[PDB]
Amino acid sequence: GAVQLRFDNTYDNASGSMNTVACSTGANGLSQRFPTFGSVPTFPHIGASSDIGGFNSPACGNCYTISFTFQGVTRSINLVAIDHAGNGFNVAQAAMDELTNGNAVALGTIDVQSQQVARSVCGL
């Protein structure tokens, strides 16, 4: 079924610290692996997901193939989830723009298809 997707400019900034998100420290935290947002291998395909409950979630680092059909073209990206969202995905604007052929701001919130894939697809 579809999940909601919106953008959050927090993730657009490469120099942001992994210590600022839910997937910071602890057994499942990403801060040792990827100290900054820009270091995640799929950047700027990064964001928050409701799959991540909060700190130390085992869903930290999950890799998702996210698909959206707009103006008769289906577009897909692979994205790493690094933070908690209340409802579906909150992603870097740049990622939403890629998903939507540059319509992220114009759309604001969309329904996407999401499929988790292996961590390795995203370089994790």
Side-chain angles (χ1 to χ4, degrees):
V3 314
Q4 296 207 298
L5 185 146
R6 58 199 68 55
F7 73 86
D8 181 341
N9 295 123
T10 289
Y11 311 120
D12 281 289
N13 300 287
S15 69
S17 175
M18 195 62 75
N19 292 320
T20 65
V21 300
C23 305
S24 56
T25 263
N28 292 305
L30 299 174
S31 286
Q32 286 310 307
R33 300 179 70 183
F34 309 108
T36 63
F37 292 169
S39 77
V40 180
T42 56
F43 179 87
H45 301 173
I46 58 161
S49 169
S50 50
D51 286 358
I52 288 163
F55 184 76
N56 198 35
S57 169
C60 282
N62 280 359
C63 182
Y64 300 90
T65 294
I66 302 172
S67 300
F68 188 63
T69 304
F70 184 71
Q71 293 165 355
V73 182
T74 301
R75 304 183 177 81
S76 307
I77 62 171
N78 301 329
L79 181 135
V80 177
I82 69 168
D83 198 6
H84 169 74
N87 176 29
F89 294 104
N90 311 332
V91 307
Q93 185 189 315
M96 189 174 181
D97 275 321
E98 287 174 61
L99 199 56
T100 62
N101 195 44
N103 289 274
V105 179
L107 294 168
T109 304
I110 67 177
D111 289 330
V112 301
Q113 288 293 312
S114 174
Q115 183 46 69
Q116 191 181 11
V117 295
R119 291 289 181 88
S120 63
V121 176
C122 284
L124 265 73

